[PDB]
Amino acid sequence: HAVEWPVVMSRFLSQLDEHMGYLQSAPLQLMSMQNLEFIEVTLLMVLTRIIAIVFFRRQELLLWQIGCVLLEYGSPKIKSLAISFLTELFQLGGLPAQPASTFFSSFLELLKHLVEMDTDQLKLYEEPLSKLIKTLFPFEAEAYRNIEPVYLNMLLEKLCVMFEDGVLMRLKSDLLKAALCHLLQYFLKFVPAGYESALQVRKVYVRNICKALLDVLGIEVDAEYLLGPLYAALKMESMEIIEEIQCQTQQENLSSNSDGISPKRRRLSSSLNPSKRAPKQTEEIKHVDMNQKSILWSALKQKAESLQISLEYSGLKNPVIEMLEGIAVVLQLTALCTVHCSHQNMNCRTFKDCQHKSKKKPSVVITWMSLDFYTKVLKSCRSLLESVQKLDLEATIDKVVKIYDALIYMQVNSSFEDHILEDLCGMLSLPWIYSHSDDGCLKLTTFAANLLTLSCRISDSYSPQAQSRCVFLLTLFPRRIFLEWRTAVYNWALQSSHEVIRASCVSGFFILLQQQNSCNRVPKILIDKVKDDSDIVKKEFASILGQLVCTLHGMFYLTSSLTEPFSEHGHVDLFCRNLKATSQHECSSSQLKASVCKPFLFLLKKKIPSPVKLAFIDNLHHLCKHLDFREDETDVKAVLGTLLNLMEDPDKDVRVAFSGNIKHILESLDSEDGFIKELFVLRMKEAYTHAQISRNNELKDTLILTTGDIGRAAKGDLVPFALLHLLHCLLSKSASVSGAAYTEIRALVAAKSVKLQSFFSQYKKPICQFLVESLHSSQMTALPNTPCQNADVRKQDVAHQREMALNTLSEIANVFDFPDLNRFLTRTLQVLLPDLAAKASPAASALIRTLGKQLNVNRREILINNFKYIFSHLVCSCSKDELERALHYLKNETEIELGSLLASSDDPYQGPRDIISPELMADYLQPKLLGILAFFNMQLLSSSVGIEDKKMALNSLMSLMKLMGPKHVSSVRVKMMTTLRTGLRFKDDFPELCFVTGVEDSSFAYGLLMELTRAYLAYADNSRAQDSAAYAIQELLSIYDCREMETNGPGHQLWRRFPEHVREILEPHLNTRYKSSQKSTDWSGVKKPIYLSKLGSNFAEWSASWAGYLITKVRHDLASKIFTCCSIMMKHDFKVTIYLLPHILVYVLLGCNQEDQQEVYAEIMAVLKHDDDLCQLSTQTVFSMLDHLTQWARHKFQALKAEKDSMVSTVDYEDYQSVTRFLDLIPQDTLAVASFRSKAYTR
Amino acid sequence: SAPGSKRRSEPPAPRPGPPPGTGHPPSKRARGFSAAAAPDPDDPFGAHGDFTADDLEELDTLASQALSQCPAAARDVSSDHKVHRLLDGMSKNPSGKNRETVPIKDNFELEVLQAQYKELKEKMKVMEEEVLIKNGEIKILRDSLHQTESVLEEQRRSHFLLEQEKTQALSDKEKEFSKKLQSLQSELQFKDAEMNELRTKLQTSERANKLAAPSVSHVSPRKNPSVVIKPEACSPQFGKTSFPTKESFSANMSLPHPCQTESGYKPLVGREDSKPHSLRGDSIKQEEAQKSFVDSWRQRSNTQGSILINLLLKQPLI
Amino acid sequence: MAGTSAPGSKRRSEPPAPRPGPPPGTGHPPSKRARGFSAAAAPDPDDPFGAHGDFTADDLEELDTLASQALSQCPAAARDVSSDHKVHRLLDGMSKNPSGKNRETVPIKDNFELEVLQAQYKELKEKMKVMEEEVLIKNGEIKILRDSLHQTESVLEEQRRSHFLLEQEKTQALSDKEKEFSKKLQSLQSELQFKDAEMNELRTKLQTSERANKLAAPSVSHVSPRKNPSVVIKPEACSPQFGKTSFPTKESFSANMSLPHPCQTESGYKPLVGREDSKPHSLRGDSIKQEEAQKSFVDSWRQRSNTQGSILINLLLKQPLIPGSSLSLCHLLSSSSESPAGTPLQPPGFGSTLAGMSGLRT
């Protein structure tokens, strides 16, 4: 308001700073800026301030957006449309606001493209703008950006033209172009010799306007025909304009060269229309000679008027760009002889003192986009010019053209890259790598095929270049990040040596280091980090982890780089990367052994913490808490893999004590367990007696006193490294206590039982190559005994493998196991009766070719195993699994084995199908047998004869299991169970005639002791949980806490239903575990709500966990086992809790703080009432637990009166009082109405 | 069927055009309290639990027009207490619908521009209801205006005796620990929350923030070494304002013997790289020509920040 | 329930009070023309649906006259005539939407009066282009209350005949009486709208008045002057106003026939005969009242209308042959002369039309 030239222009800056802060005050500046734009519309004076207020127009160019009030913008927009209507003060504006008005009209039309909905008024303002713009085209004085924004609006008018469906007619801008189509000819032909030079220069851009429009639009058929009329009649006007250029060639030789450059820009305009398809270069090749008529200097110098009109036309660099346009028009004209000779005439000039480098870009596009020579020789003709360009000291001049030359290749396999890369990066390490940084970035776009075999200099250039990219250090981030797109085209072998050269560069980065290169090397580590999807690069990421160990080491910018590298490791972490953490941890442990080697300093108090702090960092970089021991399982094995001369022994004697209660004799047991002491030794000659002396330094080695089964487990761990490297070391492993080679086979059968422990090792973790080694161990097992006796459990252990990943190498290994089945069962194929079902089981999930060959190996065995009795016959049902390959012909050979090796027959066939239907070995086999039963039922009109008077049972048993195995479903078996019943009759009930609860009635008797069969409850329940697989580690480690809960001899060994799970229990019978900590953190009234107010998934189990937190003062014997279950059920299944939950309330309400029996009661009522899925599932639990109490009271009250030790039993009768008193808190309608609400109803 | 937002824009368009006409701002409570029956007293029934105008249709957002009416005529105490017993009737009770997210923001933004305008105390009781009605899993815009919500209240929550400031000592950057924000505006929501963090002296920061949401802001800032570009024109200034947070940590951790950072040398790691990039924020080209505000970001807001780089080297040195 | 939608009517008036506080802003209304453009934002968006919606401002309420009230706010001050053009895009769009609301189901009646308020407030060509729009979009097959809005279309054209040469009256001379033959018709207000249509016949001048009238319309108006007292009732001031408008409308051919006397008149004395007796049906009835002091003005109105009829008494006799009658209107002319000589003595008024009527009735 108080707006001087000194005041308002100074006020503009803080206003710009207010704009720089944010936008969107309470709309007051929208009143002010529209007044200020009106003040700018008032502005024609204050000449210093007129440009100084245009500094606000920079902010007004900055504050153009689509995030303002639709009123306050569009009000000022039409006010701008009035300001642009009588924009003579803008048409006579000085310099910057005149430039900013074109920014403002851009700021109009860009923000006009946003959505504020003043629909036709904007189009009325558009016609108000374009008539002002055609007047601005009429009032042509200097500019082109004012035309370009109008051309941006004309492109917007083209966007208005070709929006939905309109054929580029009745367009007022094209009518203004049609008004320009005479006004240009008015400025060309008649009465125009006074001021129409810049008007022609406008008409140049005006012709270029609709030309660039015709290049812009996504065009079509004859809807786009009048969009081709943007130039078609104008081509004759361009033919007039070329004749007018000849009239413009009749210049007075006085400073018209810029207009001639504008005429060249006019010439380039129709060339740019000709640069796209389409419309007749036979017209344009004439103008190409007129384009050639610009210079035509060195060869011809033809006339004197054709000399002086070329001398001033040559100035200064845009004429060489017009020669580069004369390349481009010749690149459009397809007159390659006229192109290359003019390119030779361009090669005749080719120096220009600055301007040839701009002229050489399209000259490098001349012979290339045409591909007028051999596409490998075309590189060298450019490279010979690039040799001159490297000789030119092309400080970004031709280096941009060299950056343009990269994608300009467009036909080269590998070797053209090998020559041309010498020219670029060798200059880049010298100077001017800023443009080469774009060129290296251009290479990531250009690398779609390069570096096939002779890449050992190509990547050696780039690894030198990325090292040289640290010399400016801004391209250091650019270089391999572009190659992060581009180094996918690589193997690992020569890349490792390149990575070794990169390590040599990293060593050079480590050598040439003060603090700057290391930061770039951190980025170069980071650029190597995002360069993933290669194991050698993951080993280079392990070298980057060794650099992260170095980032643990140098600690200045390196610890600053470390977590960022760990974030880069997290950026490399497309999973939880414990896989690569297997062996590479030992490399960092070797770096820790190097840190044990870097422990010569007398820091026995300090380095005992500091190397542990070094061990703390990478483990915290591995982002874990309990990994102090879980990583130590391999790290002590890496300390076992350490030679441990003197520096590692006392380190391990202190670090294990820092790890656990693991003194040098106590952790010698932890060095004996595991036998990776002996197993990961595997380096026979020197270190073994030194390690035994180190074991004498650890445990006073009595090495005969060692666990042979753990050594047999180490023999499994040996045969991992198949085979002779194991088998040589196996002998010394055998001859340690007593054993020998290929021996002992019965101990190898225990090692085959330990192969089931290796299958237990295959159960939880994967390390998938161990199964391939297990097949080699199976090949070694055929080398051991060729034991078909093992093949009962071994094939079952192979069965338990078979879908650990469905990794296709295991399919080859299962074929090898089938070859082992062809090996161990060669004399009999006796187990191949039931292994055919396993062969049916395995080849069910096959979807592979050699599995069909493994099925053809069974069809080989249809000869080779001497196809036989019902081993060969009764497998014919499930055998028909796919019939895709000539497996079908083997199935036809099996149909031969179903017929040639082979009513009441149907009643036998149904009875055959009956045991088949209730088999459900494979779900698909049951689904096949049901599908077999469907067409078997399509043999009806005899089944109705079997439906006589009362319907002749075993038609019943057929129906009986057709319901009984339709108990719930498998997914296709559900709809397969449809054709079970409904294909047959209703069978009214006409012959539908006729011990689960005896366990369930003894389950409350099992609830009584929690000792008798709670074992058979809990352990077998965790056995179902044992195939959580694995996810999480605690879900595995529950079982070891259940092994910590394991106790209680031979009756549990009598409970070995899955004796492999008892073997998995025996596997778990060693490993200590269970560090999952807990507390109360009570919030008990909230817990009374968070029985249901926590989010209902395992929240009742969490309420059970809070009940387990409440389960302190209850019968401490298995309360810890319940607390061991509290470790489990926190991660374990909802079902796993359910087998604890009754006994919990049996435990808790023995005696617990009678006012908090109310809290138990508080769980009950609140879960029912205020809620009503996840509720209703949780309800059934609450039912079920109360039902135990009843029966448990019945077990009590029987024994209360079956007594004639009755003293505490009277206290237990007092408990039986109090528990029944606890039942008298609920009863029962409360429960019953909720059951009516529930899943429903009978309870 | 095709007049949803444009015809609804005509209310404030009528309101602001007459606001941009003439003299004093008693019209801010004149037509508004007349028009206050049209939504709020039109929602006054509260049929349990649903107001009469609010929870029937989505067009109950003339409170944003009332906020636009609050933004209409700015003098000097008029429409706020004129809506005071109306908002104590309506907006006090018809704001804890616990989802509300269709203009739950503009419901608060009505109170925000109210608190922005003038006053001390009537909204200072209303912030207790915002201290009551809060969420940690709000919508991305509902989290966004929430950052503005205590922000407009902060001026009287630092009036003289700070009057509401320790009411959110547990509803502090705990609320900024509703992390994993959305795209760069929701990143800028933290930058406005950083802009909101300028008051409230540093006695008990460990219970309230512990620089841990600021570590989550540093987690954004450790990304911000290369997280943004050309909204870096916002974000590097937000990084320059993140440089104030270390200077704020210099006035807190290097105030008397705390150092405040346990698992945050990893956080101060790329912050030190951002401290390396602090004076090197406007150092790409660095020409001698400046239109209005270009080179002053890493010169003048790095004058204090290169000191704050040395004051990022004060509780834990360089 | 606290209140019904009468509180919304208390809010719509309060929204009209928000429009009145917007009308209590200031002088010249480019911002309200922008609000008329903000209305035109809504007004273009109504027919943009073209499916089961309406002009939502008119579809908001009925008594809420914000379309007139913002136009009343747009009558702030003249700057300059684009405010009288900016709502033209708001005018014809909702008018075509009201034309897209054809047959007037339940909401299209109130549109034309909003258009009439838009016609009366400010149109430079915003009525004339609307008349150019209504030339392309008009349907006149009207009904009872729709006869009033058709006269509101007749109210526009004379108001549009104002500027400098009236600028579209010759274009309005195209819009002639070809649909106006729907008299002997709807009720007293519609007869007052027919008197407004007669006020439109006291308009559309010598470009079309020498064509359209032809003295067979005034005789049809003499049937309407019979109809206005007989085809309905309760027109005590209304037919008095309808006569007072006809007192202007019969005197609308004053300088017309006294320029070159074209006038197309076939029955040039039938309408003057029965209406002058129908004057005595009220004025000699007011001379049967014969009061000196006016009641408030309703006595003074019809007496000034009788003083206007005194000019009409001087009118037909000065040119046409008086006392050439056949019926007892000549016997009522003596009663009109009884009404004359009463009111001539009771005039104390302009002596020119007094003494002429003293020789006209006598």
| Rounded distance between C-alpha atoms, residue C323 and residue C326, angstroms | 9
CB atoms within 10 A of CB B299: 15
Instruction: Give the CA angle between residues A24, A25, A26 to the nearest 5°.
Output: 115
CB of A71 within 8 Å of any CB in chain B? yes
Q: After which residues is chain A broken (C to N over 2.5 A)?
A: 902, 994, 1172, 1204
Q: What is the token pair recorded at A922?
A: 């494979």
Q: What is the token pair recorded at B120?
A: 């001390």
Give chain A positions within 8 Å (CB) of B266.
Answer: 562-563, 566
Residue A1138 to residues A566, A996, C117, Cα–Cα distance (Å) = 42, 18, 79
Is the preceding omega at residue A744 within 30 degrees of 0, hence cis? Answer: yes
Helix (H) or strand (E) holding B223: helix B213-223
Q: Mutation test of the interface with chain A: which of B75, B269, B300, choosing the one with the most A Cβ atoms within 10 A?
A: B269
Tell me which amino acid residue A1143 is.
H
Closest CA–CA distance from residue C89 to any residue of chain A (Å): 9
Q: What is the token pair recorded at C107?
A: 């909401």
Length of chain C: 362
- Angle between helix axes B303-310 and B235-250 (nearest 10 degrees) is 50
Residue whose C-alpha is closest to residue B227's, from B188, B284, B175, B197: B188
Helix (H) or strand (E) holding B185: helix B184-196
SS (H, E, C) A481-501: HHHHHHCCCCCCHHHHHHHHH
| Contact present, B211 and B200 (Cβ < 8 Å) | no
- B47 forms bridges with which residues in the sheet? B50
B4 CB-near residues (< 8 Å, 6+ apart) = none
Helix (H, G, I), strand (E, B) or coil at A577: coil
Tell me which amino acid residue A263 is.
P
CB atoms within 10 A of CB A625: 8
A775 CB-near residues (< 8 Å, 6+ apart) = A813, A816, A817, A820
Residue whose C-alpha is closest to residue A1060's, from A758, A719, A711: A758
Closest CA–CA distance from residue B44 to any residue of chain C (Å): 8
Closest CA–CA distance from residue A71 to any residue of chain B (Å): 6
For residue A255, report the phi and psi dihedrals to the nearest 5 degrees.
60, 20
CB atoms within 10 A of CB C311: 18
Whether residues C42 and B3 touch (CB distance < 8 A) is answered with yes
Q: What is the token pair recorded at A757?
A: 């422990």
What 8-state DSSP symbol labels residue C218? H
Q: Mutation test of the interface with chain C: which of B31, B60, B69, choosing the one with the most C Cβ atoms within 10 A?
A: B31
Find the DSSP H helices in A738-848: 745-764, 769-782, 791-801, 808-824, 832-844
Give chain C positions within 8 Å (CB) of B1.
Answer: 49, 51-53
Residue A1237 to residues A134, A1177, A1185, A1232, C127, Cα–Cα distance (Å) = 78, 12, 18, 9, 70
Whether residues A26 and B16 touch (CB distance < 8 A) is answered with no
| Contact present, A784 and A818 (Cβ < 8 Å) | no
CB atoms within 10 A of CB B225: 15
| Rounded distance between C-alpha atoms, residue C110 and residue C118, angstroms | 12
Residue whose C-alpha is closest to residue A1132's, from A1039, A1010, A1045: A1039
| Contact present, A875 and A840 (Cβ < 8 Å) | yes
- Residue whose token pair is 């595997």: A682
Whether residues A560 and B292 touch (CB distance < 8 A) is answered with no
Annotate A631-649 with b (16+ C-beta within 10 A) or e (fewer): bbebbbbbbbbbbbeebbb
| Rounded distance between C-alpha atoms, residue A891 and residue C47, angstroms | 72
- B50 forms bridges with which residues in the sheet? B47
Chain B, chain C: beta-carbon pairs less than 8 Å apart = 102
Closest CA–CA distance from residue B181 to any residue of chain A (Å): 19
A866 in the Ramachandran plot: left (φ > 0), alpha (ψ -120 to 50) or beta? left
CB atoms within 10 A of CB A883: 13
DSSP string, A71-85: HHHHHHHHHHHHHTT
DSSP string, B49-89: TB-SSTTT-TT--HHHHHHHHTTT---SSHHHHHTHHHHHH
A124 CB-near residues (< 8 Å, 6+ apart) = none
Residue A600: exposed, middle, or buried by beta-carbon count in 10 A (0-12, 13-18, 19+)? exposed
| Contact present, A1140 and A1132 (Cβ < 8 Å) | no
E strands, A856-1003, in order:
none
| Rounded distance between C-alpha atoms, residue C273 and residue C142, angstroms | 31
Closest CA–CA distance from residue A191 to any residue of chain C (Å): 39
| Rounded distance between C-alpha atoms, residue A196 and residue B39, angstroms | 64
A704 CB-near residues (< 8 Å, 6+ apart) = A736, A737
Tell me which amino acid residue A17 is.
D
Give chain C positions within 8 Å (CB) of A35.
Answer: none
Largest Cα–Cα distance of chain B, in whole Å? 67
Comparing alpha-carbon positions, the chain A residue that sits nearest to C41 is A118
Residue A729 to residues A677, A741, A767, A779, A1030, Cα–Cα distance (Å) = 13, 10, 22, 18, 32
Residue whose C-alpha is closest to residue A759's, from A736, A777, A784: A777
Closest CA–CA distance from residue C35 to any residue of chain A (Å): 9
Tell me which amino acid residue C339 is.
S
CB of A13 within 8 Å of any CB in chain B? yes
Q: What is the dihedral of CA A1194, A1196, A1197, A1198, to 10 degrees?
A: 80
Q: What is the token pair recorded at C162?
A: 């104002």
Q: What is the token pair recorded at C302?
A: 């019809």
CB atoms within 10 A of CB A884: 9
Residue A624 to residues A189, A540, A578, A595, Cα–Cα distance (Å) = 84, 23, 11, 22
Task: Give the one of A27, A59, A560 whose C-beta lies nearest to B269's C-beta.
Answer: A560
| Rounded distance between C-alpha atoms, residue C66 and residue C12, angstroms | 9
CB atoms within 10 A of CB A26: 18
Whether residues A121 and C45 touch (CB distance < 8 A) is answered with no
| Contact present, A84 and A42 (Cβ < 8 Å) | no
Residue whose C-alpha is closest to residue A100's, from A155, A63, A138, A140: A63
| Rounded distance between C-alpha atoms, residue A1242 and residue C179, angstroms | 83
| Rounded distance between C-alpha atoms, residue A927 and residue A975, angstroms | 9
Task: Give the one of C31, C37, C45 whose C-beta lies nearest to A121's C-beta.
Answer: C37
| Contact present, A346 and A363 (Cβ < 8 Å) | yes
| Rounded distance between C-alpha atoms, residue A463 and residue A476, angstroms | 11
Whether residues A121 and C38 touch (CB distance < 8 A) is answered with no
Largest Cα–Cα distance of chain C, in whole Å? 74
Task: Give the one of C2, C46, C51 whose C-beta lies nearest to B44's C-beta.
Answer: C2
Long-range contacts formed by A1224-1228: CB under 8 A, 24+ apart: A1225/A1157, A1225/A1158, A1225/A1161, A1226/A1161, A1226/A1164, A1226/A1165, A1226/A1186
- Residue whose token pair is 């800023």: A434
Whether residues A56 and B292 touch (CB distance < 8 A) is answered with yes
Residue whose C-alpha is closest to residue A677's, from A707, A650, A651: A707
SS (H, E, C) A492-539: CHHHHHHHHHHHHHHHHHHHCCCCHHHHHHHHHHHHHHCCCCCHHHHH
| Contact present, A691 and A640 (Cβ < 8 Å) | yes
Q: What is the token pair recorded at C182?
A: 């729907």
What 8-state DSSP symbol labels residue C321? -
For chain A, the distance separating the N- and C-terminal CA atoms, rounded to the nearest angstrom, is: 84
| Contact present, A37 and A80 (Cβ < 8 Å) | yes
Q: What is the token pair recorded at B27?
A: 């019209």
Q: Mutation test of the interface with chain A: which of B147, B266, B282, B283, choosing the one with the most A Cβ atoms within 10 A?
A: B266
Closest CA–CA distance from residue A136 to any residue of chain C (Å): 24
HSE-CB at A464 with a 13 A cutoff on CA atoms is 15
Task: Give the one of C31, C38, C44 whose C-beta lies nearest to A120's C-beta.
Answer: C44
Give chain C positions within 8 Å (CB) of A119.
Answer: 44
Length of chain A: 1243
Whether residues A120 and C41 touch (CB distance < 8 A) is answered with no
| Contact present, C317 and C307 (Cβ < 8 Å) | no
The gap from C-alpha B222 to its chain's centroid, in whole angstroms, comes to 22
| Rounded distance between C-alpha atoms, residue A977 and residue A923, angstroms | 12
CB atoms within 10 A of CB A289: 14
Radius of gyration of chain C (CA): 23
E strands, A994-1149, in order:
none
Give chain B positions within 8 Å (CB) of C26.
Answer: 18, 21-22
Residue whose C-alpha is closest to residue C208's, from C171, C155, C166: C171
For residue B41, report the phi and psi dihedrals to the nearest 5 degrees.
-70, -20
Chain C: which residues have CB within 8 Å of chain A?
A: 31, 34, 37-38, 40-41, 44-45, 89
Q: What is the token pair recorded at A292?
A: 């050639």
The gap from C-alpha A941 to its chain's centroid, in whole angstroms, comes to 59
Q: What is the token pair recorded at C297?
A: 């003005």
| Rounded distance between C-alpha atoms, residue A433 and residue A425, angstroms | 8
What 8-state DSSP symbol labels residue A727? H
Q: Mutation test of the interface with chain C: which of B1, B6, B10, B22, choosing the one with the most C Cβ atoms within 10 A?
A: B10
Q: What is the dihedral of CA B86, B89, B91, B96, to 10 degrees?
A: 180
For residue A182, report the phi and psi dihedrals to the nearest 5 degrees.
-100, -35
What 8-state DSSP symbol labels residue A1132? S
| Rounded distance between C-alpha atoms, residue C180 and residue C201, angstroms | 10
| Rounded distance between C-alpha atoms, residue A118 and residue A112, angstroms | 10
- Residue whose token pair is 């153009």: A64
| Rounded distance between C-alpha atoms, residue A600 and residue B105, angstroms | 64
- Residue whose token pair is 């004498």: A696
Residue B257: exposed, middle, or buried by beta-carbon count in 10 A (0-12, 13-18, 19+)? exposed
For chain B, the distance separating the N- and C-terminal CA atoms, rounded to the nearest angstrom, is: 65
Q: What is the token pair recorded at C106?
A: 């339940």
| Contact present, B254 and B311 (Cβ < 8 Å) | yes
Whether residues C8 and B41 touch (CB distance < 8 A) is answered with no
Q: What is the token pair recorded at A1058?
A: 């899955």
A881 CB-near residues (< 8 Å, 6+ apart) = A840, A843, A844, A846, A924, A928
Annotate A962-971 with b (16+ C-beta within 10 A) or e (fewer): beebbeeebe
| Contact present, C261 and C213 (Cβ < 8 Å) | no
Closest CA–CA distance from residue C38 to any residue of chain A (Å): 8
| Rounded distance between C-alpha atoms, residue A267 and residue A200, angstroms | 12
Q: What is the token pair recorded at A509?
A: 């980065």
For residue B50, report the phi and psi dihedrals to the nearest 5 degrees.
-160, 125
| Rounded distance between C-alpha atoms, residue B266 and residue A618, angstroms | 12
Q: What is the dihedral of CA A56, A61, A66, A71, to 10 degrees?
A: 50
Kindly list the partner chains of chain C, i.e. chains with 3 or more CB atom pairs below 8 Å.
Answer: A, B
Helix (H, G, I), strand (E, B) or coil at B47: strand
